[PDB]
Design a protein around this ligand. Structure first.
Ligand SMILES: *[C@@H]1O[C@H](CO[C@@H]2O[C@@H](C)[C@@H](O)[C@@H](O)[C@@H]2O)[C@@H](O)[C@H](O)[C@H]1NC(C)=O
Ligand SMILES: *[C@@H]1O[C@H](CO[C@@H]2O[C@@H](C)[C@@H](O)[C@@H](O)[C@@H]2O)[C@@H](O)[C@H](O)[C@H]1NC(C)=O
Lengths: 162, 162
C-alpha cells in the first residue's frame, strides 16, 4: 500500500467539525502535532474567501490554516502566518456519535506519507481510529506514526489547553 | 463614574458566543490584546468542570482561559498556562444581529479599570460599541483605552489570523 492509495473519505459539513470542538490528536507523524488541540472555526463575516479555519494549538503556540475543498475529497490548507499550502485527505471520519467524534487525516508526498493527524474528543476510544492508524503505518514512511500524548506538560486548571 | 459602577450586563448563553466566532478586538486597554482574535470553545467532553474556554489569539501566540459564571453576571477566568484567575464583566452584549455581534467587557481593580476588551465581527460598526467605549474611558485609568488595530501585521491569505 502507498499513500496515494489510502482512502479519500467524504468530508463532513463544516458544522459537524465545529460541533466536535475541542479535539486532541492521538496519533501523529512528526513531533510538530504532539500534545496538540484542534479547533475548527467558521469563516469570518469579513472573509472574502469564506473559508473556515483549522487551529492547531500546542500550549501557548498556535498554527492556523484557512481551508477550502478541492478535488477528490481534498482539503486545501493555507497556513495563515507563512502562506504555505498543504493538501490533506481523510482516511475516515466518525463525527457526533454517542461516544463522541474521531477522524484520521493524512498528507502525502506522492507514494510516501509526510504528516498524519488522528484526532478525537473521546481519548482515542473509537475502534476505527486504532484500525486506521494500523493501515497508515503500512505506507512508505508510515513507520514514523506514533502516540501524540506520551509526555505532555502538566495542566494548570484547564483540560484542552496548557 | 468608577469601574465598580459600570453596568454588569446579562451574559448570553455560551452557544451565542460560539456562533459569533471569530471576533476581533476593536478597543483595548493595555497593548496585550491589540491585533487579537477571540474564539469561544465549548467544554471538552473529558472536562470535569465542563467550563467553556475563551481563546485570545495574537498571531502565532495564544492565551486560553477556561471560564465559569460567578455572582452578579461575572465571568471567572482561569488562564490555562499560568493558572492566574481573573474576574470580568460585560458592559453590554449585542450578539447575533443582522449586522453581526459585538460586546464590551472589562476587568476592574476596585474603582479603576485594568483591562478592557471590546470585540466584534462587524469591524466596530455597532453604535453601542463606540458608545460603551466612551463611557469606559471616564472611569479611573480608562484614559488608556485605545484602538486595537492601528498597526497589525500583514496577512498571508487568511482573514482572522496572521
Ligand atoms: C486516555 O488514554 C490513556 C491510555 O491510552 C492508551 O495507552 C497509551 C500509552 C496509548 O498507547 C494509547 O493509544 C492507548 O489507548 C490513559 O493513560 C489516560 O488515563 C486516558 N485518559 C482519560 C481516561 O481521561
Ligand atoms: C474597518 O474600519 C476601519 C476604520 O475604522 C475607523 O477608523 C479607525 C482608525 C478607528 O478609529 C475605528 O474605531 C474607526 O471605526 C477601516 O480602516 C477598515 O478598512 C475597515 N475594515 C473593513 C471595511 O473591512
Amino acid at each position: 500500500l502507498t499513500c496515494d492509495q489510502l482512502p479519500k473519505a467524504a468530508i463532513n459539513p463544516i458544522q459537524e467539525f465545529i460541533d466536535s470542538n475541542p479535539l486532541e490528536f492521538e496519533y501523529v507523524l512528526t513531533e510538530t502535532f504532539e500534545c496538540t488541540t484542534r479547533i475548527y472555526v467558521q469563516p469570518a463575516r469579513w472573509s472574502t474567501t469564506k473559508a473556515p479555519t483549522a487551529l492547531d494549538i500546542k500550549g501557548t503556540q498556535i498554527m492556523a490554516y484557512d481551508f477550502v475543498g478541492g478535488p477528490e475529497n481534498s482539503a486545501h490548507l493555507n497556513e495563515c502566518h507563512t502562506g504555505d499550502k498543504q493538501v490533506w485527505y481523510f482516511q475516515y471520519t466518525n463525527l457526533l456519535t454517542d461516544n463522541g467524534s474521531s477522524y484520521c487525516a493524512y498528507r502525502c508526498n506522492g507514494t510516501e506519507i509526510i504528516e498524519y493527524k488522528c484526532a478525537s474528543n473521546n481519548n482515542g476510544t473509537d475502534p476505527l481510529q486504532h484500525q486506521a492508524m494500523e493501515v497508515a503505518k503500512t505506507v512508505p514512511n508510515g513507520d514514523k506514526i506514533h502516540y501524540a500524548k506520551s509526555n505532555c506538560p502538566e495542566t494548570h486548571g484547564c483540560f484542552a489547553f496548557y
